[PDB]
């Protein structure tokens, strides 16, 4: 309700006293809400934006620039008005001054770096590159600022000088290029720790990734304020996202990790050289595309018989002696179970190994590039069947036990905890609905999507039965065959 000022009066007399700390979790949507028109609701929103942008530059300025970075003029949209309002808020926060313009310059430099990309491949110790990189080698020497990808702790007072600022940046760019443009940039730290920033020039839905990460953080909070969902220490792991632009955002290249897809391709060859390669599988299934159901299942059964599971060997011979190995294995099981249940609930899209990062010394999984959400895939030009990522290799990696045990228990505890805090969740998804930022691939698929969310959390079926049916529907070969090429 944003029509009558009388309602807004009795709430603007209160929120002005509210600390800025409370306004950060929803500040993506709230930032999407401002506009340049003059209204009492607009006045309150401008005051909230100024309060958060002045008291806590760090947790708000990146969103502020994200909504001011690229905004065309001729085409008419609420994005343009929100851009004008957010630019006014930025000017107001800059009048009061050094840190605001320092963060603005940092964002401009990061986006310019993400714009360009050469062609190469490098790893191991030592490397040198980058044209016009003087700004990145003397960051704090010119503007004492933190690199944009640490979880800076929120302080009640708001102003702190104890945050670490890093100037020395390594000359190495172990850039590996997937679709479109990816550049990796590692900088040092004031405490003495290096942070790796993965900048992407490709039009990955990094804003959708950011709002999804906010939902994930609130879900971590829900799992935190409970007995069963925190004795396990279960948590859907979040990697910080700082999208300066949707097409050219920058994210936190998590501490040393090997993505699942880039992994187990070398492990498949080393562990099982005799069995068939991914080339035979891929386009053989390629021949399967135009065939009938029985042919598809038959060829998939043949290829799955050829390529035995191999990811079960990562956790062996890599981490440590057995206690650390088992802690890592249970961490992976719990994190992948929570992430899978959440993705099924929110209809997360692509779930290939190229969008999965296994930690290493901890084992917690990190889903990456969650652009497709709210049941966006399945309905692809090429259809799918599985709700959440569950191959044969993944369930092999959960241990000798398949998905029956720690995985199912974690999934069912996640389901019951999500149901118990349903109301707050659907509140969060509603505020996602009413803003035009979340991708739901007037009336929208978002409404039916959250209705399906409620049905997935509906108490009509017992939670144990729901987890059993989910495991069956995501493990059965009949569903797995039609998914896509590979996915063994």
């Amino acid at each position: 309700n944003s029509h009558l000022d009388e309602l807004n009066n009795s709430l603007q007399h209160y929120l002005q006293n509210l600390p800025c700390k409370k306004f950060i979790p929803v500040f993506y949507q709230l930032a999407a809400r401002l506009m340049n028109e003059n209204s009492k609701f607009q006045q309150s929103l401008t005051s909230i934006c100024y309060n958060v942008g002045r008291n806590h530059p760090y947790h708000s300025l990146h969103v502020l620039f994200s909504l001011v970075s690229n905004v065309p003029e001729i085409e008419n949209l609420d994005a343009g008005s929100r851009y004008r309002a957010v630019k006014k808020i930025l000017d107001l926060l800059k009048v009061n001054s050094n840190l605001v313009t320092k963060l603005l310059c940092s964002f401009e430099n990061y986006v310019s770096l993400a714009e360009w990309n050469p062609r190469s491949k490098v790893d191991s110790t030592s490397f040198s590159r980058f044209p016009g990189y003087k700004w990145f080698l003397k960051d704090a020497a010119n503007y004492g600022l933190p690199p944009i990808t640490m979880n800076v702790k929120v302080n009640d007072t708001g102003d702190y000088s104890n945050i670490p600022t890093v100037s020395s940046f390594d000359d190495t760019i172990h850039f590996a290029s997937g679709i479109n443009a990816p550049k990796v940039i590692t900088c040092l730290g004031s405490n003495g720790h290096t942070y790796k920033q993965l900048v992407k020039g490709g039009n990955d839905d990094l804003r959708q990734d950011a709002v999804m990460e906010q939902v994930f953080e609130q879900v971590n909070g829900f799992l935190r304020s409970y007995r069963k969902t925190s004795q396990r220490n279960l948590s859907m792991r979040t990697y910080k996202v700082i999208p300066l632009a949707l097409k050219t955002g920058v994210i936190e290249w998590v501490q040393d990790t090997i993505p699942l897809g880039e992994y187990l391709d070398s492990a498949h060859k080393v562990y099982h050289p005799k069995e068939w390669s991914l080339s035979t599988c891929r386009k053989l299934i390629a021949e399967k595309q135009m065939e009938d159901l029985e042919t598809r299942l038959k060829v998939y059964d043949l290829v799955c018989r050829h390529y035995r599971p191999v990811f079960r060997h990562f956790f062996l011979e890599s981490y440590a002696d057995p206690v650390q190995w088992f802690t890592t294995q249970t961490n992976y099981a719990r994190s992948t179970a929570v992430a899978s249940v959440l993705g099924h609930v929110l209809g997360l899209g692509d779930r290939h190994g190229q969008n999965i990062l296994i930690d290493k010394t901890s084992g917690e999984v990190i889903h990456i590039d969650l652009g497709i959400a709210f049941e966006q895939g399945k309905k692809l030009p090429v259809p799918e069947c599985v709700p959440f990522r569950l191959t044969r290799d993944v369930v092999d990696g959960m241990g000798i036990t398949g998905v029956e045990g720690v995985f199912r228990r974690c999934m069912e505890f996640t389901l019951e905890t999500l149901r118990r805090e349903e109301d707050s969740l659907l509140s969060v998804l509603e505020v996602l609905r009413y803003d035009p930022l979340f991708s739901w691939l007037g009336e929208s698929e978002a409404e039916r999507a959250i209705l399906k969310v409620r049905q997935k959390l509906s108490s009509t079926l017992s939670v144990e039965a729901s987890v059993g049916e989910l495991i069956r529907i995501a493990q059965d070969p009949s569903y797995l065959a039609l998914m896509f090429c590979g996915w063994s």
């Binding site: 679709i179 891929r282 899209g349 692509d350 290939h352 190229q354 497709i372 966006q376 895939g377 692809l380």
Partner: peptide, 8 residues
């Protein structure tokens, strides 16, 4: 690379 392009 081989995963579906997820294009519109």
């Amino acid at each position: 690379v081989s995963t579906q392009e997820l294009y519109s």
